[PDB]
Amino acid sequence: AKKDIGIQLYSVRDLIGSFGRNQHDYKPVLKALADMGYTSIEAASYNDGKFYGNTPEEFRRDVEAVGMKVLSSHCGKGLSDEELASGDFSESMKWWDQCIAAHKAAGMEYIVTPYLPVPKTLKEMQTYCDYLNAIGKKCREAGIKYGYHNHAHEFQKIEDKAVMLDYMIENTDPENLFIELDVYWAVMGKASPVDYFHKYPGRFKMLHIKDRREIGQSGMVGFDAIFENAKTAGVENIIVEVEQYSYDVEKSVKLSLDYLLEAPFVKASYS
Template sequence: MGTQHRSSTRALRGVVAATVAALCLGVGGVSTASVASAAPPACAGRGVPTSKISVQLWTFAEYIGFGTDAATIARTEEVFASLREMGYRNVEPFTLSGLTAEQYRALLDEYGLKASARHVDVGTPANPADIEQILAENKVLGITFFGSGSTPIFPPVYTTEAQWVAYAEYLDDLGARARHHGQTLMVHNHDVEFETVFGGRTVFDILMDSTERKNVVFQLDLYWAANGGGADNPIDVIEEYGNRIKLFHVKDMAAGPVPGPIEIVGRGVIDFPSIFDAAGGSTKYYVVEHDPRFGDPTFDPFEAAEVGFDYLDCVRF
């Protein structure tokens, strides 16, 4: 990590993760048939509380689409109905698909779902967002946590430490305004925040150091944290920053050369039990996510969501 380097022995973590995955999901050589009969009494309802499990709807981005027409809304309803049947009670939207906040809230209510958090563009110092409108929408939607789906890295916008500090200070101001409305601004990472270093501090460190804990919290994307800083990086970050990390994006990494591609939760190599254990009781939501594989017909977002829910419902830590 940026300000400190800590060495620790975690050789058994991968073994523990693989064992848990095998027991709960039938991977690692355990047959599907044996798991089907053995898993329910051993695992069901004993993992993460259902009230804390959510799913980032970006998983369904290709399926739902980016339109605002009736067909887009119908696909959104289909996704909501399926998620409810899988066991989800929370979702994390990234778009309202052309609906007003009132209409989107009504759709959530119809399917017994809650918006646990929201990804929405909160702007930059050069292009500030209409924060008052966002806060008003959030109030209708019932959302507490919100923030952009990424820092300005698509494409990379900032190349100096001063620019990142200015961006963090902008977020801190937005967070202070949100706090006065009973809402909380969150920052979501990718790999770049851990790979970009200025004077021994990563961009992630800068975002932490230049914001106040009362104004800004963090949603740690576990795949991107591991991708950008190594397999143990999520735990290093948690050990350093503690309960400033309030939400996880639970996203897995495929086996093989590291960093590997995104994998369905529980079928990869990220040691979720150790990560969850390190976080203690500070995690508000565990958000299943699998980035869409645009143009790949073999990817099924419904499978990714269902397997992810079942894993979290089962995992012990």
């Protein structure tokens, strides 16, 4: 494999189906992704110490057997209304110990929260920032880097004062939280990926390489510019994500990889 490129498994969710007893039969897709040349995965199916209904140990064996790294995972635990109003998120913090230990057992380097809604107030946003720091701190102590993945909504303002993502970056410690920047959703939020990189150097330790459909197809994403600035950003790993397709899913995710493999501005490794 010429370059280290990750695949988010959410991209292949249609290709994971029940076979006999198995309700999450991901092994055939994992082989297909490895054959294409993907070198790592990011999971999108965590629940109560398990990945795709499997032990972290078995999931990790499955990924490693096709020669890919268990790099990262999307999961999270939002605060209740009461936690958010009180400031007291000790209950939610209990969830994180099991999650962190399972992620570690699956050999994960990163844990990423995929989604938080826009808070109604800066106060609520700040409580979220405290939670994020507490999570990130527990992760770091266990040897895992915790991050946050955007869509488009985080470029909205809270209370017409602060942009959500900006507030989040500014009010979390760099060692507790990096941003897994989705460059497509950033653009969809009228944000410049490169300007974000320059405003917050080192905070973007992974990218979600996403486009409307196949990567580099739409005209909506300046991958050249993005990759040119990956060093300012602090990029360690890149993860392809494809949720809409011009072809069968495998072909779409394959063509998406090929764009990156053939692009001279994508280095063989960022880590």
